[PDB]
Structure formats: structure tokens, C-alpha cells
Design an enzyme around this catalytic site. Structure first.
Site, PDB file in Angstrom:
ATOM      1  N   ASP A  28      43.952  23.971 -32.291  1.00 24.99           N
ATOM      2  CA  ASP A  28      43.456  25.339 -32.254  1.00 24.99           C
ATOM      3  C   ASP A  28      44.165  26.219 -33.275  1.00 24.99           C
ATOM      4  O   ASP A  28      45.296  25.941 -33.685  1.00 24.99           O
ATOM      5  CB  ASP A  28      43.634  25.945 -30.859  1.00 24.99           C
ATOM      6  CG  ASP A  28      42.551  25.511 -29.896  1.00 24.99           C
ATOM      7  OD1 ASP A  28      41.680  24.719 -30.299  1.00 24.99           O
ATOM      8  OD2 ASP A  28      42.563  25.967 -28.738  1.00 24.99           O
ATOM      9  N   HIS A 173      48.116  23.095 -31.210  1.00 27.12           N
ATOM     10  CA  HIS A 173      47.857  24.244 -32.066  1.00 27.12           C
ATOM     11  C   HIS A 173      48.249  23.952 -33.505  1.00 27.12           C
ATOM     12  O   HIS A 173      49.225  23.244 -33.768  1.00 27.12           O
ATOM     13  CB  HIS A 173      48.609  25.489 -31.573  1.00 27.12           C
ATOM     14  CG  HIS A 173      48.155  25.980 -30.234  1.00 27.12           C
ATOM     15  ND1 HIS A 173      48.768  25.608 -29.057  1.00 27.12           N
ATOM     16  CD2 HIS A 173      47.144  26.811 -29.885  1.00 27.12           C
ATOM     17  CE1 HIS A 173      48.156  26.191 -28.041  1.00 27.12           C
ATOM     18  NE2 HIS A 173      47.167  26.926 -28.516  1.00 27.12           N
TER      19      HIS A 173
HETATM   20  O1  LIG Z   1      43.504  28.329 -27.624  1.00 27.69           O
HETATM   21  C1  LIG Z   1      44.495  29.053 -27.529  1.00 27.69           C
HETATM   22  N1  LIG Z   1      44.842  29.858 -28.518  1.00 27.69           N
HETATM   23  O2  LIG Z   1      44.060  29.888 -29.686  1.00 27.69           O
HETATM   24  C2  LIG Z   1      45.350  29.019 -26.262  1.00 27.69           C
HETATM   25  C3  LIG Z   1      46.365  29.935 -26.021  1.00 27.69           C
HETATM   26  C4  LIG Z   1      47.111  29.854 -24.850  1.00 27.69           C
HETATM   27  C5  LIG Z   1      46.838  28.858 -23.920  1.00 27.69           C
HETATM   28  C6  LIG Z   1      47.618  28.723 -22.654  1.00 27.69           C
HETATM   29  C7  LIG Z   1      48.915  28.216 -22.702  1.00 27.69           C
HETATM   30  C8  LIG Z   1      49.675  28.065 -21.538  1.00 27.69           C
HETATM   31  C9  LIG Z   1      49.152  28.410 -20.295  1.00 27.69           C
HETATM   32  C10 LIG Z   1      47.824  28.925 -20.205  1.00 27.69           C
HETATM   33  C11 LIG Z   1      47.265  29.286 -18.945  1.00 27.69           C
HETATM   34  C12 LIG Z   1      45.968  29.785 -18.881  1.00 27.69           C
HETATM   35  C13 LIG Z   1      45.206  29.938 -20.043  1.00 27.69           C
HETATM   36  C14 LIG Z   1      45.723  29.597 -21.290  1.00 27.69           C
HETATM   37  C15 LIG Z   1      47.048  29.080 -21.393  1.00 27.69           C
HETATM   38  C16 LIG Z   1      45.832  27.947 -24.176  1.00 27.69           C
HETATM   39  C17 LIG Z   1      45.088  28.031 -25.335  1.00 27.69           C
END
Ligand SMILES: O=C(NO)c1ccc(-c2cccc3ccccc23)cc1
Ligand SMILES: [Cl-]
Ligand code: NA
Ligand code: NA
Ligand code: NA
Ligand code: NA
Ligand code: NA
Ligand code: NA
Ligand code: NA
EC number: 3.5.1.104
Length: 214
Positions: A28, A173
Site C-alpha cells: 500500500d 506498505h
Molecule cells: O492501507 C493503509 N494505509 O494506506 C492502512 C493504514 C493503517 C492500517 C491499520 C494498521 C493497524 C491497525 C489497524 C486497525 C484498523 C484499521 C486499520 C489498521 C491498515 C492499512
């Protein structure tokens, strides 16, 4: 917020089929200049394809790395344009973030990506309903490397190898300027050990048996 009931009502899923020895690596926030090229190289050394959810604003800055991803057999996904909390926007701004990013990726990769991933995993039911009618498919994740915290490769490896099952969709990421070096080095340990257990790495189109384009 009913994530479970939505997988029966819309094109929306957290993981893949339980009866296939397949997992999916996803990345991502790219493209970027430092982490995306490294990931692409380590994916090349391990004979592994992946799925990249690209931000629209970042595909503008580095248009060739978007082309490098598609030319190396990987699949590109829509990660909105400017990474907003989709739960806090209205329908027109939601539909603006999607369609704008789609046109940018269609120009570079040659196809309109079918897969959408909402930033922070936040999305509303009407937003999900619209994308289903527009022949999109939203895919979240079931294994979180929490690599944005800047954790080490050994920590990410035990976290991935400890929660991965047939059909797992793993989240990493390639964010510009993030602390993600351990997340890149983890691929040298994650990929061989899952292969030892008999797992195969596939893209999202192959996992959910659908086209990569819309
Ligand atoms: O695609 C992302 N950024 O571009 C992204 C960012 C943060 C997280 C993320 C990280 C950790 C815990 C989480 C708990 C609920 C929802 C998202 C969470 C997951 C994905
Ligand atoms: Cl299809
Ligand atoms: Na949800
Ligand atoms: Na699931
Ligand atoms: Na599953
Ligand atoms: Na450079
Ligand atoms: Na419309
Ligand atoms: Na399983
Ligand atoms: Na899983």
C-alpha cells in the site's frame, strides 16, 4: 458497521478460499522511490507476484514505477487519490477519489484496476454498494504486518508466519518516507518459510477468480 454481513451482500472480502494452498502479498501507499523498487527486486528473486494498491497522487509523481509494476506481471489496485478517511467524506468526494485515481492508473498501466482497498479499512455501506454496481471489488486483509510502526524483519516474520492460513491476504506498505526497511527484509524470510509449508503466492485476481480490470 457490519463487516461480516457485507461479504454476503457486496463484492467485499478479507481473505481467500480456504481450500487452496495460496496466500496473497499486498502493498500500500506506493509508488515511491526507495521501497517500491526494492520490494519489486525481492519479489523478482523469489519468483513471486503481488498486488499493489497505489495512491493516485503518488502515481502522478513517479509514473514509470507504476509502469514497472505492470510490466513485471504484478497487479495494480486502487488506493484512492489523497488517502482520506472515506468514512468522513460524502458520496461525490468518495466517487471523485475513485474515478480520478482510476483514470491515472488506466493511463499508465493500460487498464482500469478492478480492486479497491480503502485507506485505514474505513468504508461505508453505500460506498460499498456503489463500487459493487460499478464492477469493483474491495479487498481488505487478514494478516497485518503493522510494519508502519517501524518494526524489525524478525518481528514481522513471526507475526506473519504465526497468523497466516490458506487464503490469507497480507498487508505491507511502500509508503514514501516511512520506516519500512525491516518490512522489505522480511520478504527474504516470509516467502521461503511459507513455501516450506506448501503455500503458493498469487495475486488478488487469481485468488478471487476475477479479472484484474474493470
Ligand atoms: O492501507 C493503509 N494505509 O494506506 C492502512 C493504514 C493503517 C492500517 C491499520 C494498521 C493497524 C491497525 C489497524 C486497525 C484498523 C484499521 C486499520 C489498521 C491498515 C492499512
Ligand atoms: Cl471477470
Ligand atoms: Na469493516
Ligand atoms: Na475472511
Ligand atoms: Na479465508
Ligand atoms: Na533516486
Ligand atoms: Na456514477
Ligand atoms: Na484457511
Ligand atoms: Na488469514
Amino acid at each position: 458497521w457490519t463487516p461480516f454481513s457485507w461479504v454476503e451482500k457486496y463484492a467485499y472480502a478479507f481473505s481467500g478460499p480456504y481450500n487452496k494452498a495460496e496466500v496473497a502479498l499486498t502493498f500500500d501507499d506506493g509508488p515511491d522511490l526507495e521501497f517500491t523498487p526494492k520490494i519489486l527486486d525481492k519479489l523478482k528473486q523469489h519468483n513471486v507476484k503481488a498486488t499493489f494498491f497505489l495512491l493516485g497522487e503518488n502515481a502522478e509523481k513517479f509514473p514509470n514505477i507504476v509502469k514497472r509494476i505492470a510490466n513485471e506481471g504484478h497487479v495494480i489496485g486502487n488506493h484512492t487519490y489523497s488517502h482520506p478517511n472515506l468514512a468522513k467524506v460524502n458520496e461525490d468526494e468518495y466517487r471523485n477519489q475513485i474515478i480520478k485515481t482510476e483514470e491515472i492508473l488506466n493511463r499508465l498501466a493500460g487498464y482500469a484496476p478492478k480492486f479497491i482497498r480503502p485507506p485505514y479499512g474505513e468504508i461505508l455501506e453505500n460506498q460499498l454498494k456503489w463500487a459493487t454496481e460499478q464492477n469493483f471489488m474491495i479487498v481488505q486483509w487478514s494478516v497485518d504486518t503493522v510494519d508502519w510502526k517501524g518494526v524489525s524483519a524478525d518481528t514481522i516474520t513471526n507475526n506473519v508466519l504465526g497468523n497466516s492460513f490458506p487464503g490469507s491476504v497480507i498487508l505491507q506498505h511502500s509508503t514514501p518516507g516511512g520506516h519500512l526497511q525491516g518490512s522489505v527484509d522480511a520478504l527474504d524470510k516470509i516467502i521461503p518459510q511459507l513455501k516450506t509449508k506448501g503455500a503458493r503466492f498469487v495475486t488478488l485476481p487469481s485468488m478471487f477468480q476475477t479479472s484484474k480490470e474493470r
